[PDB]
């Protein structure tokens, strides 16, 4: 297996990962090559399909012209997976639209056909042994998987031989439960992957490790001191939100209620939903009314993001902030949510001044709501620093970039390519 670690039965949590030796903050516990992975459609042309390296002048696949590579070696190594989509993409044309989950599951089935035996990705936990929670799925979740199965059949019939429907339901459920999203240094979505040994770790809202990525290789580093006998915990979710929001997501997606110290004490809940100190204090009903409103506009914006124009999306963020500000302070996480969304729209519009203003309001509340070594905090420092440098605010840029580096050295390792890249940006402008 993995030296210094062991799989064990964690009471109430199924299987888990336990330390057999001590690990200090910043230590690498283990690394795990991707069992299967896929580059997200929006990042094609910026990243190599095989190894995920970002660079300019990638070689384009001459057949489909929609997959880019470092060189012919990366291209040849990616062929067993790319051929599932190369020709279908041109033949289906505009009508080719399998969801990312379908794309990943197709590559899982292809990997199983080629490499049926245990891989180096599965030293402690195999894909076949993944938890499915099939008995807990409701009809709406089962009907969505069955829709995914139909898409899998529609788009991948010529390259894949399918198991029976029951096996496909289980596999999709296992993917929903154990799959990982890969993000770049700015926490932008890069793709999806299966990391079997990383999937073994249970969840905590005060985790003692963080998962980062070196291309398609997952790495796991301590962000708290870990002693022999202690369970290794990662976070499955965005830790910005209060306990009821976190446990709503964990129950819905992973079918458990978290009992970590943060969930048990709820010690950060009050700061996360901070209320303005008005002459007449807002009543509990009014607070719960604004929280309900906030959750609704968050959902409305998530839908609107697919079709509305950038200026229209900014309008939603502006109006929602105005209404919430009558009750919520700026450090309130529902305010911060819409500010972050507005920043995203500004970054896409290349409105650097607009994005900088939002970043400056977000970073200090982020620092206190998130844990000590949060990737959400590091990436916000990084966005600020790059905005500053781009706008020729060299001194503020350097300060922000160094703040990002200080965190990433712990989470990513001092020798990570991301840290080398960021140091160039300090000594370029």
């Amino acid at each position: 297996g993995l030296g210094g670690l062991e799989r064990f039965c964690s009471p109430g949590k199924g299987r888990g990962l336990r330390a057999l030796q001590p690990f200090q903050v910043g230590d690498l516990l283990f690394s795990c090559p991707a069992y299967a992975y896929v580059l997200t459609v929006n990042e094609r042309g910026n990243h190599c399909e095989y190894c995920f390296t970002r660079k300019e002048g990638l070689s384009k696949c001459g057949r489909c012209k929609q997959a880019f590579y470092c060189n012919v070696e990366c291209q040849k190594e990616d062929w067993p997976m790319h051929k599932l989509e190369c020709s279908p993409m041109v033949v289906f044309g505009e009508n080719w639209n399998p969801s990312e989950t379908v794309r990943l599951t197709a590559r899982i089935l292809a990997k199983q056909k080629i490499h049926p035996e245990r891989t180096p990705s599965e030293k402690l936990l195999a894909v076949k042994e993944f938890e499915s929670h099939l008995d807990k799925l409701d009809n709406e979740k089962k009907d969505l998987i069955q829709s995914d199965i139909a898409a899998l059949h529609h788009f991948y019939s010529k390259h894949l031989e399918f198991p029976d429907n029951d096996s496909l339901v289980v596999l999709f459920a296992q993917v929903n439960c154990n799959g990982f999203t890969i993000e770049d240094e700015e926490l932008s979505h890069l793709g999806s992957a299966i990391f079997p040994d990383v999937a073994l770790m249970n969840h905590s809202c005060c985790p003692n490790v963080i998962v980062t990525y070196k291309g398609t290789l997952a790495e796991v580093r301590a962000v708290q001191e870990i002693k022999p006998g202690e369970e290794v915990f990662t976070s499955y979710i965005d830790l910005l939100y209060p306990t009821e929001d976190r446990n709503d997501r964990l129950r819905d997606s992973y079918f458990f209620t978290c009992e970590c110290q943060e969930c048990t004490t709820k010690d950060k809940d009050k700061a996360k939903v901070e209320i303005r100190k008005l002459s007449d204090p807002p009543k509990a009903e009014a607070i719960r009314d604004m929280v309900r409103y906030a959750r609704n506009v968050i959902e409305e914006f998530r839908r609107a993001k697919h079709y509305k124009s950038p200026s229209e999306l900014l309008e939603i963020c502006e109006l929602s902030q105005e209404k919430m500000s009558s009750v919520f302070e700026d450090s309130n996480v529902y305010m911060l949510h819409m500010m972050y969304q507005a920043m995203g729209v500004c970054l896409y519009m290349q409105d650097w001044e607009g994005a900088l203003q939002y970043g400056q309001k977000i970073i200090k509340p982020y620092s206190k709501h998130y844990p000590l070594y949060s990737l959400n905090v590091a990436s916000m420092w990084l966005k600020l620093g790059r905005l500053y440098m781009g706008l020729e605010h060299k001194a503020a840029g350097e300060k922000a970039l160094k703040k990002a580096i200080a965190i990433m050295e712990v989470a990513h390792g001092k020798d990570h390519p991301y840290i080398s890249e960021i140091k160039q940006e300090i000594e370029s402008h």
Binding site: R54, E186, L347, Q350, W352, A355, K383, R386, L387, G390
Partner: peptide
């Protein structure tokens, strides 16, 4: 990854 912003386009800057």
């Amino acid at each position: 990854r912003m386009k800057l």
